[PDB]
Amino acid sequence: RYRKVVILGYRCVGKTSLAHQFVEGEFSEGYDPTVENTYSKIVTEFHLHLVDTAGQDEYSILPYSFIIGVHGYVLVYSVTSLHSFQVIESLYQKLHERVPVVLVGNKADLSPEREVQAVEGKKLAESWGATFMESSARENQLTQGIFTKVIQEIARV
Numbered sequence: 741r742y743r744k745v746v747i748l749g750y751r752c753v754g755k756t757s758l759a760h761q762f763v764e765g766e767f768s769e770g771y772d773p774t775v776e777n778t779y780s781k782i783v784t785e786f787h788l789h790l791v792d793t794a795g796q797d798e799y800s801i802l803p804y805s806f807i808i809g810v811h812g813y814v815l816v817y818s819v820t821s822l823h824s825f826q827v828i829e830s831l832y833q834k835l836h837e838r839v840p841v842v843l844v845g846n847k848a849d850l851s852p853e854r855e856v857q858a859v860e861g862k863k864l865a866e867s868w869g870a871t872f873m874e875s876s877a878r879e880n881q882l883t884q885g886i887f888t889k890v891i892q893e894i895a896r897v
């Protein structure tokens with residue numbers, strides 16, 4: 741079963757690091773601004789095509805490539821950046837202007853720097869009818885769950 745999932749978020753929230761942890765089982769402390777990557781993985785039988793997008797902000801205009809043919813979305817913000825959490829709301833609105841959406845507050849490992857509480861992202865997700873979780877691209881355990889969830893959620897809907 742072929743399925744296309746688009747990862748969206750503000751820049752530097754860890755979109756690429758999430759996708760790379762999930763697919764290659766590695767985390768890099770480096771940084772490379774994404775133009776567009778695609779990561780293919782077989783999740784057990786679904787052929788998952790992850791479209792890892794360029795970071796976006798409150799003014800950006802999302803192209804058709806992000807809306808058409810998309811079976812599901814992973815919307816990522818960073819728990820250490822409220823600005824990124826504010827942008828993910830805009831990005832959602834632009835999106836609705838129905839698919840499974842999993843909302844991910846990433847970089848939960850960086851606890852001392854947290855700005856956005858779990859209960860806060862959970863409520864936002866609830867307001868959309870989306871599933872919510874937190875993660876760290878540094879933990880394979882935490883990262884797998886995001887992507888197995890969005891697939892289970894597509895098989896659901």
Ligand SMILES: Nc1nc2c(ncn2[C@@H]2O[C@H](COP(=O)(O)OP(=O)(O)NP(=O)(O)O)[C@@H](O)[C@H]2O)c(=O)[nH]1
Nearest residue numbers: 751752753754755756757769773774795847876877
């Ligand atoms: N501690 C920690 N660092 C993270 C986490 N996720 C990403 N990072 C780090 O944060 C930086 C941003 O990661 P990146 O994956 O490039 O984010 P992005 O959303 O893909 N950026 P862009 O929109 O520019 O493509 C990187 O230097 C990476 O090492 C995480 O969960 N925890």
Ligand SMILES: [Mg+2]
Nearest residue numbers: 755756773774
């Ligand atoms: Mg990226």
